[PDB]
Amino acid sequence: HSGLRKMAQPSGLVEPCIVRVSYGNNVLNGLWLGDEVICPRHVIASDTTRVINYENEMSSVRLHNFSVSKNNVFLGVVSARYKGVNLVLKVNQVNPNTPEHKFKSIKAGESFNILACYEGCPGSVYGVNMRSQGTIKGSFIAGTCGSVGYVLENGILYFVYMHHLELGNGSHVGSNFEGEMYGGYEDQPSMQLEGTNVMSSDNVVAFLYAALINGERWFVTNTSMSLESYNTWAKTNSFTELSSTDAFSMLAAKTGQSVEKLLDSIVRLNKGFGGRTILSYGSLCDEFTPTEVIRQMYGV
Numbered sequence: 001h002s003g004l005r006k007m008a009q010p011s012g013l014v015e016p017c018i019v020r021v022s023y024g025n026n027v028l029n030g031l032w033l034g035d036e037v038i039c040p041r042h043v044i045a046s047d048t049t050r051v052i053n054y055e056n057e058m059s060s061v062r063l064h065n066f067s068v069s070k071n072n073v074f075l076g077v078v079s080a081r082y083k084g085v086n087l088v089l090k091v092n093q094v095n096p097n098t099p100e101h102k103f104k105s106i107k108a109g110e111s112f113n114i115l116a117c118y119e120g121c122p123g124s125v126y127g128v129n130m131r132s133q134g135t136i137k138g139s140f141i142a143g144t145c146g147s148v149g150y151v152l153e154n155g156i157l158y159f160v161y162m163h164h165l166e167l168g169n170g171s172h173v174g175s176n177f178e179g180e181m182y183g184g185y186e187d188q189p190s191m192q193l194e195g196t197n198v199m200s201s202d203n204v205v206a207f208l209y210a211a212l213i214n215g216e217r218w219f220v221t222n223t224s225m226s227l228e229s230y231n232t233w234a235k236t237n238s239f240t241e242l243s244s245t246d247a248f249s250m251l252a253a254k255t256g257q258s259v260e261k262l263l264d265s266i267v268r269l270n271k272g273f274g275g276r277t278i279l280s281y282g283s284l285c286d287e288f289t290p291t292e293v294i295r296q297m298y299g300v
């Protein structure tokens with residue numbers, strides 16, 4: 001009974017890039033790469049608790065009003081441009097600890113790492129999973145805007161997320177480094193709603209395989225459901241369509257349960273667990289990808 005737990009990738013490369021950026025009373029995090037610092041543009045808003053006119057804020061932006069710092073290092077701001085909802089600051093000094101990196105976007109249902117930082121101090125690291133609506137269930141609180149999401153893929157560091165805001169339902173909204181807010185959300189204190197959650201089927205199947213590997217089998221019966229039939233069902237029950245079962249071959253082989261037996265399990269279990277649990281959860285979990293589960297269980 002090893003169980004199943006959300007893991008992060010190490011944060012070592014990312015920590016030395018974090019700086020503190022402030023403008024007026026606002027204080028948040030920046031990402032210092034080469035001679036550039038990146039942070040949410042709302043750092044410039046004179047009042048972030050009411051609707052913001054960003055065209056009017058930028059016009060009155062005076063560079064000298066920025067304070068960017070790390071340790072005893074105070075960076076000078078030589079210029080500042082919007083890149084979508086991200087503010088981009090050319091500073092007078094190159095970050096000697098800049099790692100080799102690239103930028104990419106995260107897709108619905110994919111996992112990545114958060115380094116959560118409080119006004120410049122990196123404080124925690126934990127894995128997250130992008131929800132259907134482009135949000136994540138982070139744990140962001142006051143001071144953590146500009147915290148950074150990243151993934152390591154074959155020895156290559158990708159920066160993928162910059163944190164911006166929290167929705168009424170406790171879901172969290174961020175941007176990629178092209179300055180597009182994931183899910184299209186605006187960077188405003190509008191009482192925006194997330195929209196309905198569509199659970200990732202691939203991920204829920206991964207999670208059920210993890211439970212089987214761990215010796216929990218109650219939710220498997222002597223019935224299965226074909227991919228096509230399951231997809232017809234998921235379109236009308238807030239689940240994603242499953243395009244292929246190839247992703248799960250290893251899990252199916254190791255557990256002797258076909259993906260199709262687990263599609264049947266989802267349809268039954270979505271109506272309720274009947275008092276029982278699965279890896280301690282009393283409801284379906286879609287936070288782990290198939291790949292995440294295979295590496296964690298087998299190290300492939």
Ligand SMILES: *[C@H](O)[C@H](C[C@@H]1CCNC1=O)NC(=O)[C@H](CC(C)C)NC(=O)OCc1ccccc1
Nearest residue numbers: 042048140141142143144145164165166188189
């Ligand atoms: C920036 O650090 C901050 C992070 C929020 C604060 C608490 N949890 C978070 O994720 N972002 C904002 O304060 C943001 C500003 C833009 C909308 C211009 N406003 C916001 O997120 O309001 C929602 C909220 C605020 C305070 C507590 C709970 C939700």
